Design a protein around this ligand. Sequence first.
Ligand SMILES: CC(C)C[C@@H](NC(=O)[C@H](Cc1ccccc1)NC(=O)c1cnccn1)B(O)O
Ligand SMILES: CC(C)C[C@@H](NC(=O)[C@H](Cc1ccccc1)NC(=O)c1cnccn1)B(O)O
Ligand SMILES: CC(C)C[C@@H](NC(=O)[C@H](Cc1ccccc1)NC(=O)c1cnccn1)B(O)O
Ligand SMILES: CC(C)C[C@@H](NC(=O)[C@H](Cc1ccccc1)NC(=O)c1cnccn1)B(O)O
Ligand SMILES: CC(C)C[C@@H](NC(=O)[C@H](Cc1ccccc1)NC(=O)c1cnccn1)B(O)O
Ligand SMILES: CC(C)C[C@@H](NC(=O)[C@H](Cc1ccccc1)NC(=O)c1cnccn1)B(O)O
Ligand SMILES: CC(C)C[C@@H](NC(=O)[C@H](Cc1ccccc1)NC(=O)c1cnccn1)B(O)O
Ligand SMILES: CC(C)C[C@@H](NC(=O)[C@H](Cc1ccccc1)NC(=O)c1cnccn1)B(O)O
Ligand SMILES: CC(C)C[C@@H](NC(=O)[C@H](Cc1ccccc1)NC(=O)c1cnccn1)B(O)O
Ligand SMILES: CC(C)C[C@@H](NC(=O)[C@H](Cc1ccccc1)NC(=O)c1cnccn1)B(O)O
Lengths: 175, 175, 175, 175, 175, 175, 175, 175, 175, 175
Amino acid sequence: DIYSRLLKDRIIMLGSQIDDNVANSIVSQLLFLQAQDSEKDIYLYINSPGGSVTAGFAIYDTIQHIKPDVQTICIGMAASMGSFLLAAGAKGKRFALPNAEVMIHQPLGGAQGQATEIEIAANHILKTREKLNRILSERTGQSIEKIQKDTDRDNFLTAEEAKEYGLIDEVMVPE
Amino acid sequence: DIYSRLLKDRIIMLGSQIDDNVANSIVSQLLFLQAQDSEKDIYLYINSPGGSVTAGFAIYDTIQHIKPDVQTICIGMAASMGSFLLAAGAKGKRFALPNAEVMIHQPLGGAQGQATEIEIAANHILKTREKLNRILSERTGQSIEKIQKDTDRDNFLTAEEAKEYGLIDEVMVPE
Amino acid sequence: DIYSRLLKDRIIMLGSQIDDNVANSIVSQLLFLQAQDSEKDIYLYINSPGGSVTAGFAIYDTIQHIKPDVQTICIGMAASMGSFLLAAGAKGKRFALPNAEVMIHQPLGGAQGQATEIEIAANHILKTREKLNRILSERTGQSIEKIQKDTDRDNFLTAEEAKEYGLIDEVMVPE
Amino acid sequence: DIYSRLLKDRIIMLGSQIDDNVANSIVSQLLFLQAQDSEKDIYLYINSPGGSVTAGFAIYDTIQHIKPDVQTICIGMAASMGSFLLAAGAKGKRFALPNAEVMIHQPLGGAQGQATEIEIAANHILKTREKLNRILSERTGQSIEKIQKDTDRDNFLTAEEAKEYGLIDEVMVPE
Amino acid sequence: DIYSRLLKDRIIMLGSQIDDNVANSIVSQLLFLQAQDSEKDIYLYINSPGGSVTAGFAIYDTIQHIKPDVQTICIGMAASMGSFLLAAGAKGKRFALPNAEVMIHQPLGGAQGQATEIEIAANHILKTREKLNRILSERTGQSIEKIQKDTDRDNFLTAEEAKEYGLIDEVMVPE
Amino acid sequence: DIYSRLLKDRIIMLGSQIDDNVANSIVSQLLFLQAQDSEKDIYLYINSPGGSVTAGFAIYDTIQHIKPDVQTICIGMAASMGSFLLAAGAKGKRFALPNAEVMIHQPLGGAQGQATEIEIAANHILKTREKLNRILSERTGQSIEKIQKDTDRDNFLTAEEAKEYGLIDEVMVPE
Amino acid sequence: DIYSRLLKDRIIMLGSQIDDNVANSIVSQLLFLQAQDSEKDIYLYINSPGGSVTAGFAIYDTIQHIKPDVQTICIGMAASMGSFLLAAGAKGKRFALPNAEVMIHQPLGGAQGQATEIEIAANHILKTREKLNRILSERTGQSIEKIQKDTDRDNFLTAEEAKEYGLIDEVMVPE
Amino acid sequence: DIYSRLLKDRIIMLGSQIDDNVANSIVSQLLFLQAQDSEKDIYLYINSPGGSVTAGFAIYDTIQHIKPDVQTICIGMAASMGSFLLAAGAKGKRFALPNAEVMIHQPLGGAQGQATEIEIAANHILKTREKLNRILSERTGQSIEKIQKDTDRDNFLTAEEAKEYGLIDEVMVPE
Amino acid sequence: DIYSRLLKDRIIMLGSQIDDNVANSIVSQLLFLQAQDSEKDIYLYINSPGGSVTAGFAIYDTIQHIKPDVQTICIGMAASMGSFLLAAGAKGKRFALPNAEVMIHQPLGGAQGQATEIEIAANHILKTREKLNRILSERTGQSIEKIQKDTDRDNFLTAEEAKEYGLIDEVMVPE
Amino acid sequence: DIYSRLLKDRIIMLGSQIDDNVANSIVSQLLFLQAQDSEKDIYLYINSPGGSVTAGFAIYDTIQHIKPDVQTICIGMAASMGSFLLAAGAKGKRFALPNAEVMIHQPLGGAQGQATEIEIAANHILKTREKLNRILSERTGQSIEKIQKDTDRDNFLTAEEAKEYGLIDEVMVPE
Ligand SMILES: CC(C)C[C@@H](NC(=O)[C@H](Cc1ccccc1)NC(=O)c1cnccn1)B(O)O
Ligand SMILES: CC(C)C[C@@H](NC(=O)[C@H](Cc1ccccc1)NC(=O)c1cnccn1)B(O)O
Ligand SMILES: CC(C)C[C@@H](NC(=O)[C@H](Cc1ccccc1)NC(=O)c1cnccn1)B(O)O
Ligand SMILES: CC(C)C[C@@H](NC(=O)[C@H](Cc1ccccc1)NC(=O)c1cnccn1)B(O)O
Ligand SMILES: CC(C)C[C@@H](NC(=O)[C@H](Cc1ccccc1)NC(=O)c1cnccn1)B(O)O
Ligand SMILES: CC(C)C[C@@H](NC(=O)[C@H](Cc1ccccc1)NC(=O)c1cnccn1)B(O)O
Ligand SMILES: CC(C)C[C@@H](NC(=O)[C@H](Cc1ccccc1)NC(=O)c1cnccn1)B(O)O
Ligand SMILES: CC(C)C[C@@H](NC(=O)[C@H](Cc1ccccc1)NC(=O)c1cnccn1)B(O)O
Ligand SMILES: CC(C)C[C@@H](NC(=O)[C@H](Cc1ccccc1)NC(=O)c1cnccn1)B(O)O
Ligand SMILES: CC(C)C[C@@H](NC(=O)[C@H](Cc1ccccc1)NC(=O)c1cnccn1)B(O)O
């Protein structure tokens, strides 16, 4: 299988929606790569429309925890939790290809039941948003109040705009 | 039709779920009965599992607004917005048959979408619960804190317990 | 319509499963009949497999509340809440045809959700069973503990067994 | 409507599956006809594939109970509970048109649940079959054990065979 | 039918979602009422969650065009196009009952297909929003800029808040 | 019924999608109104999203073919065949309410099967478009070239724009 | 397989809902790892929304039974039965990554059928909640009264709050 | 695969509902293990909600027939036929983990068709229940009369209660 | 597998709809091929109906971003994003077989929700179309306005027409 | 796998409907076979009901473009695009088994949407039919005018008739 080959070059492809299955695969790949060698870089290609917040945080925390630097490279599109993980790469080693698109927006969810259950769910998603904003602020240098306003609705960015936003460090030019 | 002849005796049957169709029928019947005679009493029989809050308030406010006293008679069951409307009858003229059951609980709803929209919906239903608690406190004489605690979960009441609670004035004995 | 003609003779047909629609129709027919004449007997024919408890209690309490005697006549079958309403007729005026079947059993229901919600639902249905047992004991003369054992599972009775049970007073012979 | 003009000639058409709705319609038509005149004959045309045992007994017991003779005339087909009601007409006044088919067979049913519940359901339907076999033996002049043997499976009979069997008295010839 | 005799009191009930069927019914009632008498007032009760913009404008333009004053009375809820029609009543004669809910928000829609067809749909709905904002500014005295910001998301208003906003003129007290 | 009342005033409401049922109803109403009086005007109110071309042409040809002038009044919306019929009213007597919308676009259809079957269906719809374009050109005073270009995609028009275009003669102002 | 290589390092990934299939896989992995070496530690990564109580106890009891210490590491989320198993790791060796979320709440279930069946199911789930509360009390040091109040509704905890609660021993810092 | 290496340690995992597929897998594992060695023990782990009686007896009879002792160890849950197989292990060698649950109840089934087919099915399931009771009485030392009463409804047992009942010999402690 | 033997000749088959899975496979194969040899040509056979813009740009940017020349050979059909990638091959090395079809058209999409959300989606797809038009203008030597007009609707091109258009350099002759 | 073994003898079996997956498999097998040896003959067995035109042309153009002669052998049936590929084998090496059936007919498709879109699709399928007719004229020696008339509807041919027609060169006799 072709991805088996790429893993020998320490390359991980995140090329789908992020659910728990995908997150456990990515996490296990990071841990496996760290075991083989704990100082050579890892390369995480990202072509993802987003997905679950907790699954995304499973990958995020693993990236920060392991010893090797994790380079992130957006090809095609990094939207929602995909752009959050793009910004999570080793600073100075976060890239996008020239025609890649990046999109940021606020979390989405749902809640049903009694008034108290809806209040619990609303409080949980607002806390989850404040937590995502605070971390994105630390990864980009944007202020939390600006993240909050810029993610009120869907916010599409070119690769160059993503760099000026601080989500990546360089647009990768050919070749 | 049987209900049309009962209407000539100024009797209205609320015997179903409360949605907008039912609420409009009940409201129009109260209006029509007030026009025919504005001082003879009206009798509202209630056998209802509850329904929409705004459809319920359409009936509640029409009862409060018109001239005639509206007697409320719970037969079978008055649950949720049903029991709220039972408590809304003219004071001294709120009844339940001996084996009727009354149930009270907090509102239920749902919300989907972005975090800010879920927060808007959560705030709306909590505000709605506060409004219902306040009115029920006025109709029963119980405190708002007691209502709030007693409606945290489904709360089933006998006709006698509903009288002790202040939801009704008397249990109707034969004949 | 044929049932309209029978209502002229103060005859009500209960020939279906008992839900809120059926109960409100039956209740309105009883009240309409009492208005026309409050001393002439009413005849309630019962061919019913049962239905909702609260809908059944809407009919029960109305029968006990109005002035006229309500005679009950089982044709075909009175099961579950149907036999409960059969036993509710004016004492001495509860009948069944010779090949009618009567069936008694304990209530059924369902509950889903949190442990506390299931606890609340279980407590409500056990309270509802104790109430049904107590009233059936008063209508039949059977002890509450015998009702409890006899309704543990489905209990089919001939018309003659139903009379010796106290659910009816006489088996109607031709003509 | 055509059937109500026929009711003025004391003609009742049973022309469908026998459920509770149909049984209550037929029963009410018999009582109504007896009320208008309690001596003049009633004519019950039967074209039915059968139906519910209890619904059929509602019609059967009403036929035996009223004062007027009830003639039964099979047109097209009287199967299962249909043929039971065909045999139920006033003796000497049970007919079939020359090309009508009569079918008899044993009761069918179903049972789901615990072993004790399946035993209760089996006993009930076996008792039901014995009661039907006994009545048909009285109405036809055949032995119970012959009825049992001849209904073990679907048993189709011509009009002439139904007369030979005792289910009807005469085959109706033109004119 | 109850709504028929209410119409003789010049009362119209808008108690459902607004589609073309409902709109054509309301419009024909307004025309019919003007034909019988063209100076006596008309009373339009509103309990509606909203609906189609063009259906709503059929009712709006008819209200403005006919000669009689059209009073608007919100019972239960006036949301979206329902609250737009509430504010369309004759000034000084727009009411809400004390527990009625009013909600305002921006239009919603959908678009599918080629880029140029999506552009056509976006331009059409933004033009529609500008037209709604401008009319609501005229009916309420609020500025278009405030309407735009206040309708960005769902905005729930009590009867008292709707009066302060200018959507209604008075909250209707008993009796 | 309310529409029967309006038809005595020679008012016809076209308030739905135009299919064959609707067309036959409108056509029969026009024929019936012409028979009652062949000189007094007829008023066709239009709130329609369009529909079938042949159903539309049934109404169109009938309007052209009856002696009385047929006034057309767009309320809410006249799109597609709806706006074609709006433009078909007696010149000088075509109206729209101030907030009515008008939309024009080319016909739509489908074709499946062999190549020669698809070619036949393509030629039939192109000939249909050319006929519709020519007739609309004559009703509006526009060139066929301009109609063709302006209906290539969905084209939304305000009431004032529709008057400028020649689809209506006057915007109806209040009173 | 990537999970196969991690099993070489005595790492087990519980990254899904807990049903019987998953529980048997986790149990067999623990058994297999103990047989290979009964004194080297085992590492249980948890990213789970929870699941079946009995499947959870199959894993819990196997963890307690075997010789090796079992470290638990919450990545992403440990909700419900997932957080119960997180607290079950060897004391001193229960961890969570800094942005992992932990949630605790009371059990859920369902019951259908006769009143006595519903009572049996209610008693079972309440007994199951008492058992879980008691064990969690032992694992965290919190009182059973506190657990019972804190799990009445969904209760979301940060990694730091989970440490304060006693569900984990340390938050894992990089690197 | 993990279960293969466990089979080398003579471990069999019964961790699912028991149907014919599972039974044939378990049976072939028992025979395969006997062929390799006919005197060393076999270990059957049981986490099962139950299943088919005949599939269960395929496993039961195979366990009794082969030479090696089969230890049974309930993890998580042994319900219905699962608890029957738990009690089927070699006496002295039947265990449950401390938080395992055990449930016993009477068989369930269904029957549809003619009265004689229902009677056949009823007799077959009653015979099956007598056979299960007699074997369980032998495995546990309890009387058949007590088994019959204790299995009338669902009967949940802790590991300790199962030992007292005789279903297991010991609750296995760590480690 | 046949495609892996072709990969050793540096042949990549793009023979399906272009989604993220396909894009990541193609990207992985380009990277892998560049790693084995960074100067020898790569051959990308294209038989595709098109697909996702972002997935297509993942392949496009990878093609421009590797050192080796990528020849593109259209077999069967290159439509939509398929034809975009066909034009993306190394200039002078873009081919089509004599009977391959090439189709170009403008992007398609959808948008649902509030007016502001629809405007965001419309602007994003219009910007996407502009970006695609500019690149195709550079790759084909046609003007932006000609690309815009020629893609307003589906535009089918033979292999020879595709060469005249600049989408390919040569039509590949036999053999 | 059996088809792998036959590829050793340079045998490719086209035995299914022709879509893009199948076409890419066949194309890749031809290229792979040409790589191993570019002068040994290839044998393509055809048993196909047809399929996509563009997928068929992918196979056709590859057959003409490789160096080796491709023999075509129809077994069972070559219908529609299947017979087109049969006629495409190296002249003198196109065969059919004596009972194989051959069928030719004109292309089929479908179109939906605006009139201009149906015209585009009609023109495209007509152009495709003309290209198919011209190539088959060249492969068979029949005139385009004869192909056009013979493919108006389904035209079934025996192996012998296919030889007379020019679709094949010889009917294969045993052995
Ligand atoms: C940066 C952030 C915007 C990324 C993703 N956003 C989300 O909102 C996801 C959407 C979702 C996915 C599957 C199932 C339901 C919901 N929401 C949650 O995981 C969540 C978290 N905490 C509480 C409630 N929900 B993105 O891909 O859009
Ligand atoms: C508690 C009692 C006094 C009244 C009723 N309780 C409710 O929860 C209803 C239930 C509902 C069901 C289906 C669809 C919608 C609503 N909730 C609302 O109307 C509502 C209002 N505002 C915000 C959110 N929800 B009862 O009678 O059922
Ligand atoms: C004498 C009595 C045995 C009669 C009826 N028995 C019942 O169990 C009904 C059945 C039912 C039917 C449809 C949907 C749900 C339940 N149960 C309730 O109404 C109920 C349940 N829980 C709490 C309060 N009430 B019988 O006639 O079916
Ligand atoms: C003389 C007699 C043979 C006539 C009818 N026979 C039946 O079996 C009916 C069929 C049926 C229809 C609807 C729903 C269930 C069953 N059975 C019962 O009504 C029944 C069953 N079990 C216990 C009590 N009653 B016939 O018309 O076929
Ligand atoms: C702001 C408030 C006055 C709006 C009310 N209606 C809407 O937003 C509707 C929603 C809808 C209803 C039926 C069918 C489709 C869509 N949208 C349109 O009608 C529409 C959309 N795009 C262009 C033009 N019009 B309210 O009830 O929400
Ligand atoms: C353009 C405008 C003046 C009128 C309407 N346009 C249409 O295309 C309708 C839509 C349709 C309805 C039912 C079934 C299929 C299609 N098309 C036809 O009736 C038709 C199509 N092909 C040949 C002949 N007739 B409008 O409402 O959009
Ligand atoms: C850890 C605990 C606080 C909640 C966890 N599980 C539950 O509540 C489950 C929900 C469920 C899932 C699948 C199938 C059935 C039920 N309930 C039961 O297993 C159960 C046990 N005994 C009696 C009744 N129910 B958690 O992970 O949600
Ligand atoms: C007491 C306890 C040991 C019962 C176990 N099984 C059953 O009761 C099953 C339920 C069932 C399962 C699959 C298909 C159909 C029915 N019933 C039968 O197998 C059966 C056999 N013969 C006659 C009638 N029924 B337990 O494990 O659930
Ligand atoms: C490049 C041009 C020749 C058209 C090609 N692709 C498209 O139009 C796709 C269609 C699609 C289908 C399913 C899911 C998503 C998109 N549209 C987009 O990707 C898109 C989405 N949002 C904004 C901008 N673009 B071609 O292959 O049809
Ligand atoms: C040999 C030839 C005369 C007929 C063969 N195929 C066709 O006619 C297919 C039918 C079809 C199959 C799959 C999907 C869509 C349509 N049509 C096209 O491929 C097509 C052509 N031109 C424009 C658009 N589509 B045969 O095998 O039937």
